[PDB]
């Protein structure tokens, strides 16, 4: 339907090479503890200072349609490499303009491209089980320190923050990022059970100071449905005020009937009473009730299954809590006096759905509910003084979470890229089926000091001498960019997630090897 | 999908210095006593003349892509700066630029931008902590009037007007400012409780002049609903006449049946009474309903909470206000007859409101309402001949009215920029980590003269040798650049809040940091 | 968003003097006796020949966006002086224009401008002073035909119809200008109260000429509510009948089935009554139809205060008018023999209702109303053979009454100008605080002899010269530009309103001095 331009041989690759080279220039200068930011204009407000890899390569597009290409092909590498690994972008984008522009000048008349592309997986996979072979697990809290410090861009006080943070809520806890108002960063750890829904009228406040409602050892009555009728409600105000213990009514919605008896007799004699609608907008907000029921220790009245009716509410129907506060925005139950072996149970079976398919929000709902139920969230507020300072401090911050699981999942090995300079030999080991797998293996030997030398020169160094002197030195020892000295990595703290540079090779090397194949090229005319 | 353009290194630096330096030569004409003003066109109707550095700065966009960059994030600093403090944006423009500037020339090959702004950030923090040492409270309301003078372009009568209201009003009242028909300044006191409601039929009139309806030691009586029913209002005109004593129905609306009864008995039997709707239209109606009942000393009839029936209604549930007028806009309760522990109850019931959240309009009904129950409110009708010149007297008496709100809060230091002036023997006893954060330590000393040099440039004097003199003069002797010669600031009231001193070079210091880490720029090629 | 053009000092000076002075050149042909007049496209129909300087002034707009910006001054300055004084815009023009150009001079590197505005302000409070100090009240009709004469371009017979209409109705009445189809100008007074509501059926008429209801010593019935029903309408039927007078039923309409009984009965019996639709469509319904009450004598039936029904109606109820017509238009009722008191009443009701607030509406229908009841309204048909020439009649007849209004409630000085030039010596005895404000008294004293200059200068004489003379002339002897010589104002009649003078000279000076402030101008890049 719409006229093409078909473009053959040398030209076509040449377009393609100006492109990824144009985009990887752009983004190699946010690689390292000395790199740049870049600027980021942004149509509607303020310009975007970022020092993140793919945010930088997403953001470039260009007018001729072949640099267009060469660019799509280093978004996707930087893309996948983020959504897979979520760090190692800036290092995926160099690996795959170097193998790139490595495999152009290799390919002519006579050569195989298939081959040599066949002959880099093969030198892919073993560079990859080679660094399995030399990672080392994480043990001790200082190394999640040292980890986080990495990642962040050299920042002692997020490192630390994201250590103790996994150290209160554990090393697979559920640790969330969000802008804070303030100058400085600061950690919450929530606790129990908490969810945004506030009490609906301002009538059961009882506190001094907060304008909250305070209860300890307090009674729970959870119902899946509204409560309307009188007689729906009386007979648990009964118990209540029969056991003289306060009470809390969590359901969907208390309405006006419901809630003008409730109000009148807390108004009157005095009966402590709140009523907190239920958090969850569709079947979440059944597991969330049920979740309740256990952790307190009772039933939920108006399910499905029993439908258990709350005009037979007992004294052992109603949950037991140490203490409840609600205000105008959250509640939040502590001390729930429900049996261990049913709360172990219930979260047996959260793991278990956990593994059994995968949504993109339900992990994150199982995950969210399993941290209620057994050490509770962390949640990091980025402070700054503008928007643009916090955003880029919460993008960094989010680097080095993804990167300390990473870390935590799969192990360490050497930071700085010396990771991959050590798996040269690994290398030397390799039997070439033919001439163009030996393209390839060579290639790909060429590639592995890619990373080393160029954080080397965003340093200001001379990255191939430091390449040089770091091969030629021991097998630990590397080289501090930061300081600009040769050091030992391991003790000095300069480390990285093998999950992260395994991942980066692989997808670098397994776009830019099918890149390299081609010899004709079709592009839409530009028509406007 | 937008083609973008790429600008590496030096040139994108010097196009945003050149739009970054064009909107600080624009804004920082707005310096001093002697500065002059900016005219901005209106597409609609006439020119805005004013003097604000975030109304000029927020005016201003470029056509090229650039330029345009540096002008967004100098704006970002002159709106950060007005939003929190409320004054001292041009003082943050000019930081701003001096940041940038010079911290363009020191980026070379072996510079690290990161540690440059990591030092910055140190020293504005010693700065700030200087400032905060070297400061002084507020305490006769002299010092008021010379804050307001000095913020207001060195104007005695606004100054003494702001200084009057806070005296007579509180130096946390609440003061409004508005445009003003006549030709000078009118201050006016809103004592008691006043709401925007006037006398629903004009047939309640028993005045001579005015054409309102004038009562003394007068019964009140609140309904949060509607009043219709006849036998819903016939109980308390019972109860009025019995008693021989002036009535208020102060309700949401009183229909066409009770309107007709009270009219109609009023002009038949000269039956005092009145009606007036209920000021507010949501949560905030009842808020206040509960505050006019407290003050004067009563009930609301109609409320969920206890539904007090107004058949039975008492001669006890009355409130009495010594003195009530109602005109056709709006009527005043004065002299209510409550119990004063009632009403400081509901005055800690109201602070404590004041400080559990933050919606951007529930703080300014909560102040609203405090200041009706305990001193009332002050507004301030800035007087003018053409719209033109009200707007900028405005525009100064908000500034001014900020600005002794922060020294209120925080304190004052040495007007005229020699505050940051006195703060440079305070950088010389930091310790740089490395080469970077010297010059880091270097940039923001060398910022520190800015102010007082744009000062002294706008009088027409050269800055660079009265910032000499200043150094070299004692730690109390300044500059007054209005009269142009070495004075004593104290005496002669020559002091800026503190607060604003601090909010300014840490939100300049803060952007401009960041910008000056830029090595590479990504725009929207301007198809259109 | 959208990208602005700055300019800097000089350059937006001249380029804002530039379109301040094409502006001010184009009004100022239109001063003094011998100007000439103006004429203006109009998109729809025929241009608009007109001398007003408002008029010139608001339909000039320029392309260049600065010099715009001068002209929406200068529009700014005639829309003021025109809104708050109704003449004197083109003394407003050139005295703005004259400011401009002497302060734009005066800028420099050392000068304050803020300081300047601050002298001009206090020159121009002097020269106020002054004047009100040697302006003489008006007390003899002469003045006022003199004044007339004067503000309507020397024309004797609009003075004269002007001075017969105020003598008719009080120099504070309701005088109205519409345009007339014939050749000259008519002056027509509307006594008692008449309201453009007529009969309904075209069968009431019983007089020979006109096609009229003409009745004397009639009775008059109003109902707020309509008229529908039967019984409603009986009884008054009876008591006239049985009185044997005419009656009159003022509603909002009598509808078809009393309408009908009404007709059958006049045509068979011969019964003299007529019907009329009540005036006013709102609240003014309401109280014109009391007005009506009160002047005849009686009460309204169906109002909302006390209800009185129409089937209890009695002869005292009805109100005696000695002579009543209603034609097709309107209706027409006089001699209500209505008490004095009752009108003396509410006559002080509707000045002190004049007196509460003002809504631009409501102050023209108290107006009116107080004038139905005392004296009489005025209405004047400007005559003329075309549309231009009535237009620009009834322009200078609107001029004429402001200016006429303006000197009855303010007083009189010299006209041609001379009243500022002796204003010229106060301004000597001013001390200056600094420099800034000695040149803002030159400037003032320099621009008071724009005015005469400019009406010399239209004249075809040497503006300079003819001001010199008068200057060195006698306390009282000016110079008439009409006669072209140097004769006695008073004696002359060649006198203004202080109030017209004074208003033009302080909104002139306002806005110019706030104008030359500027040394930044911003404007919208002109993309369309
Ligand atoms: N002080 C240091 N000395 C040497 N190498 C470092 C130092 N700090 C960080 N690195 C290395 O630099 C890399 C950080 O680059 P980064 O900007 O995170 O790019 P990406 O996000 O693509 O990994 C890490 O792989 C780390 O090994
Ligand atoms: N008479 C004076 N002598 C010396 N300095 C002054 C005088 N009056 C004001 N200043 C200084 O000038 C500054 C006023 O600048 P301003 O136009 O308010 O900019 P901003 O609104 O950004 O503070 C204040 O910081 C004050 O210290
Ligand atoms: N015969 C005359 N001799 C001298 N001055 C006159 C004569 N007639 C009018 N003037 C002066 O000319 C002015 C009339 O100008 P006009 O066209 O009304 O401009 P504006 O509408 O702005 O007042 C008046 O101020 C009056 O004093
Ligand atoms: F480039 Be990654 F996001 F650290
Ligand atoms: F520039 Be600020 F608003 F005084
Ligand atoms: F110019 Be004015 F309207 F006489
Ligand atoms: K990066
Ligand atoms: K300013
Ligand atoms: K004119
Ligand atoms: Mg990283
Ligand atoms: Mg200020
Ligand atoms: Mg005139």
Same mark, same amino acid.
């Given at each position: 339907?719409?006229?093409?331009?078909?473009?053959?041989?040398?030209?076509?690759?040449?377009?393609?090479?100006?492109?990824?080279?144009?985009?990887?220039?752009?983004?190699?200068?946010?690689?390292?503890?000395?790199?740049?930011?870049?600027?980021?204009?942004?149509?509607?407000?303020?310009?975007?200072?970022?020092?993140?890899?793919?945010?930088?390569?997403?953001? %470039?597009?260009?007018?001729?349609?072949?640099?267009?290409?060469?660019?799509?092909?280093?978004?996707?590498?930087?893309?996948?490499?983020?959504?897979?690994?979520?760090?190692?972008?800036?290092?995926?984008?160099?690996?795959?303009?170097?193998?790139?522009?490595?495999?152009?000048?290799?390919?002519?008349?006579?050569?195989?491209?298939?081959?040599?592309?066949?002959?880099? @997986? #093969?030198?892919?996979?073993?560079?990859?089980?080679?660094?399995?072979?030399?990672?080392?697990?994480?043990?001790?809290?200082?190394?999640?320190?040292?980890?986080?410090?990495?990642?962040?861009?050299?920042?002692?006080?997020?490192?630390?923050?994201?250590?103790?943070?996994?150290?209160?809520?554990?090393?697979?806890?559920?640790?969330?990022?969000?802008?804070?108002?303030?100058?400085?960063?600061?950690?919450?750890?929530?606790?129990?059970?908490?969810?945004?829904?506030?009490?609906?009228?301002?009538?059961? %406040?009882?506190?001094?100071?907060?304008?909250?409602?305070?209860?300890?050892?307090?009674?729970?009555?959870?119902?899946?449905?509204?409560?309307?009728?009188?007689? /729906?409600?009386?007979?648990?105000?009964?118990?209540?005020?029969?056991?003289?213990?306060? =009470?809390?009514?969590?359901?969907?919605?208390?309405?006006?009937?419901?809630?003008?008896?409730?109000? #009148?007799?807390? =108004?009157?004699?005095?009966?402590?009473?709140?009523?907190?609608?239920?958090?969850?907008?569709?079947?979440?907000?059944?597991?969330?009730?049920?979740?309740?029921?256990?952790?307190?220790?009772?039933?939920?009245?108006?399910?499905?299954?029993?439908?258990?009716?709350?005009?037979?509410?007992?004294?052992?129907? =109603?949950?037991?809590?140490?203490?409840?506060?609600?205000?105008?925005?959250?509640?939040? #139950?502590?001390?729930?006096?429900?049996?261990?072996?049913?709360?172990?149970?219930?979260?047996?079976?959260?793991?278990?759905?956990?593994?059994?398919?995968?949504?993109?929000?339900?992990?994150?709902?199982?995950?969210?509910?399993?941290?209620?139920?057994?050490?509770?969230?962390?949640? =990091?507020?980025?402070?700054?003084? /503008?928007?643009?300072?916090?955003?880029?401090?919460?993008?960094?911050?989010?680097?080095?979470?993804?990167?300390?699981?990473?870390?935590?999942?799969?192990?360490?090995?050497?930071?700085?890229?010396?990771?991959?300079?050590?798996?040269?030999?690994?290398?030397?080991?390799?039997?070439?089926?033919?001439?163009?797998?030996?393209?390839?293996?060579?290639?790909?030997?060429?590639?592995?000091? %890619?990373?080393?030398?160029?954080?080397?020169?965003?340093?200001?160094?001379?990255?191939?001498?430091?390449?040089?002197?770091?091969?030629?030195?021991?097998?630990?020892?590397?080289?501090?960019? @930061?300081?600009?000295?040769?050091?030992?990595?391991?003790?000095?703290?300069?480390?990285?997630?093998?999950?992260?540079?395994?991942?980066?090779? #692989?997808?670098?090397?397994?776009?830019?090897?099918?890149?390299?194949?081609?010899?004709?090229?079709?592009?839409?005319?530009?028509?406007?």
């Amino acid at each position: 339907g719409s006229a093409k331009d078909v473009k053959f041989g040398a030209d076509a690759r040449a377009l393609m090479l100006q492109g990824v080279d144009l985009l990887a220039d752009a983004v190699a200068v946010t690689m390292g503890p000395k790199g740049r930011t870049v600027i980021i204009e942004q149509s509607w407000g303020s310009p975007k200072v970022t020092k993140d890899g793919v945010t930088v390569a997403k953001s %470039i597009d260009l007018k001729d349609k072949y640099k267009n290409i060469g660019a799509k092909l280093v978004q996707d590498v930087a893309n996948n490499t983020n959504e897979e690994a979520g760090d190692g972008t800036t290092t995926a984008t160099v690996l795959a303009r170097s193998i790139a522009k490595e495999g152009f000048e290799k390919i002519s008349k006579g050569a195989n491209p298939v081959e040599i592309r066949r002959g880099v @997986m #093969l030198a892919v996979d073993a560079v990859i089980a080679e660094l399995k072979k030399q990672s080392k697990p994480v043990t001790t809290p200082e190394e999640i320190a040292q980890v986080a410090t990495i990642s962040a861009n050299g920042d002692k006080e997020i490192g630390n923050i994201i250590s103790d943070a996994m150290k209160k809520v554990g090393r697979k806890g559920v640790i969330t990022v969000k802008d804070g108002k303030t100058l400085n960063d600061e950690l919450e750890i929530i606790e129990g059970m908490k969810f945004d829904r506030g009490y609906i009228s301002p009538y059961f %406040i009882n506190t001094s100071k907060g304008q909250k409602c305070e209860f300890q050892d307090a009674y729970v009555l959870l119902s899946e449905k509204k409560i309307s009728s009188i007689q /729906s409600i009386v007979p648990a105000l009964e118990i209540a005020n029969a056991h003289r213990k306060p =009470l809390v009514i969590i359901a969907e919605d208390v309405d006006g009937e419901a809630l003008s008896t409730l109000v #009148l007799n807390r =108004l009157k004699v005095g009966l402590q009473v709140v009523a907190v609608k239920a958090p969850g907008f569709g079947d979440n907000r059944k597991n969330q009730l049920k979740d309740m029921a256990i952790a307190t220790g009772g039933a939920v009245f108006g399910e499905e299954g029993l439908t258990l009716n709350l005009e037979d509410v007992q004294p052992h129907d =109603l949950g037991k809590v140490g203490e409840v506060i609600v205000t105008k925005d959250d509640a939040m #139950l502590l001390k729930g006096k429900g049996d261990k072996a049913q709360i172990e149970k219930r979260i047996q079976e959260i793991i278990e759905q956990l593994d059994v398919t995968t949504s993109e929000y339900e992990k994150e709902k199982l995950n969210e509910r399993l941290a209620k139920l057994s050490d509770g969230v962390a949640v =990091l507020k980025v402070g700054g003084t /503008s928007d643009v300072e916090v955003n880029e401090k919460k993008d960094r911050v989010t680097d080095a979470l993804n990167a300390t699981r990473a870390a935590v999942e799969e192990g360490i090995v050497l930071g700085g890229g010396c990771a991959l300079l050590r798996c040269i030999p690994a290398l030397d080991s390799l039997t070439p089926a033919n001439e163009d797998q030996k393209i390839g293996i060579e290639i790909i030997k060429r590639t592995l000091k %890619i990373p080393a030398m160029t954080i080397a020169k965003n340093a200001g160094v001379e990255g191939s001498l430091i390449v040089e002197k770091i091969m030629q030195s021991s097998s630990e020892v590397g080289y501090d960019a @930061m300081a600009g000295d040769f050091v030992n990595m391991v003790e000095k703290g300069i480390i990285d997630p093998t999950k992260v540079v395994r991942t980066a090779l #692989l997808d670098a090397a397994g776009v830019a090897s099918l890149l390299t194949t081609a010899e004709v090229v079709v592009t839409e005319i530009p028509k406007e």
